[PDB]
């Protein structure tokens, strides 16, 4: 049986609530405070999910938390895009069952341009007819798609893991294709899609970083873990010390 895919399906997180009050009028402060809370909650699930991935424990302990803290934005945006596609055909951004963004909220969040890119990603799942299984393997690969320019504690273990997840993606593409030209076209499409997540994540990193710095001035609350990661890890990315791994040369 499909052992790798069996695992990915088994560990996939369930629904996560934001806790937002949908009876109160929309506002920048309320919307972003709710998104930040959702981030804190989702992070807990992402950590447990990551820790349960095949071969994850092969990584040095320090590298395990590092990759999670560098890739969380991309991982969460990719999953949100998938949820939006499956639940509302990318019409709105389905952050959570209790936090669905319509155009009004996209504007009130002062994140309209970023929401546009996130919604575009969501539409790609439909345009490219991405399968639930392709989604699972791609999301797993996103965890191993951003590292320090000077390397990790034990880079060899990481390189081996990333290699194996790329191999599993190629395997999923061939599980219903006889012509190699079709496999190659699909792999090209999927790697392009994966790359497209990085620029979106970077824009969100810049936005949340700026928001944190001025959080006290605009009444936006940041939970413990979010404030830590955004002030300690995110800047490493924005300053170019940690960079995404692209398939194609940008
Ligand atoms: C980082 C952030 C809170 C957490 C948000 C993020 C947008 C992307 C996103 C999608 C999710 O489904 C989980 C929460 C996250 C990860 C928000 C952009 C600015 C805000 O501060």
Swiss-Prot record:
Site: Interaction with coactivator FXXLF and FXXFY motifs. Where?
228
UniProt-annotated location(s): Nucleus; Cytoplasm
- Known outcome of mutating residue 113 to N: In prostate cancer; somatic mutation
Effect after changing residue 75 to F:
In AIS and prostate cancer
Effect of substituting residue 80 to V: In PAIS and AIS
Highest taxon listed in the record's lineage? Eukaryota
What does the annotation give as the result of altering residue 227 to T? In prostate cancer
Q: Mutating residue 46 to M has which effect?
A: In prostate cancer; gain in function
Tell me the segments the record calls region Interaction with KAT7.
1-249
Coiled coil feature spans? none
The outcome of changing residue 86 to A is:
In prostate cancer
Family under the similarity heading: Belongs to the nuclear hormone receptor family. NR3 subfamily.
Q: How does it assemble?
A: Binds DNA as a homodimer. Part of a ternary complex containing AR, EFCAB6/DJBP and PARK7. Interacts with HIPK3 and NR0B2 in the presence of androgen. The ligand binding domain interacts with KAT7/HBO1 in the presence of dihydrotestosterone. Interacts with EFCAB6/DJBP, PQBP1, RANBP9, RBAK, SPDEF, SRA1, TGFB1I1 and RREB1. Interacts with ZMIZ1/ZIMP10 and ZMIZ2/ZMIP7 which both enhance its transactivation activity. Interacts with SLC30A9 and RAD54L2/ARIP4. Interacts with MACROD1 (via macro domain).
This protein is called Androgen receptor
């Amino acid at each position: 049986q499909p052992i790798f895919l069996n695992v990915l399906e088994a560990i996939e997180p369930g629904v996560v609530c934001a806790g937002h009050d949908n009876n109160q009028p929309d506002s920048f402060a309320a919307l972003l405070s709710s998104l930040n809370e959702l981030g804190e909650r989702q992070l807990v699930h992402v950590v447990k999910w990551a820790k349960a991935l095949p071969g994850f424990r092969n990584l040095h302990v320090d590298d395990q938390m590092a990759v999670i803290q560098y890739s969380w934005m991309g991982l969460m945006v990719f999953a949100m895009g998938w949820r939006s596609f499956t639940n509302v055909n990318s019409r709105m951004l389905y952050f959570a069952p209790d936090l669905v963004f319509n155009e009004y909220r996209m504007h009130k969040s002062r994140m309209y341009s970023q929401c546009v890119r996130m919604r575009h990603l969501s539409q790609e799942f439909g345009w490219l007819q991405i399968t639930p299984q392709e989604f699972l393997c791609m999301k797993a690969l996103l965890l191993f798609s951003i590292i320090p320019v000077d390397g990790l504690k034990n880079q060899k273990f990481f390189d081996e893991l990333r290699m194996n997840y790329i191999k599993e993606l190629d395997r999923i593409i061939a599980c219903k294709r006889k012509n190699p030209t079709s496999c190659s076209r699909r792999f090209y499409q999927l790697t392009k899609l994966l790359d497209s997540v990085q620029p979106i994540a970077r824009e969100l990193h810049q936005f949340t970083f700026d928001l944190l710095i001025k959080s006290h001035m605009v009444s936006v609350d940041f939970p413990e873990m979010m404030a830590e990661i955004i002030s300690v890890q995110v800047p490493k990315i924005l300053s170019g010390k940690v960079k995404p791994i692209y398939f194609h040369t940008q």
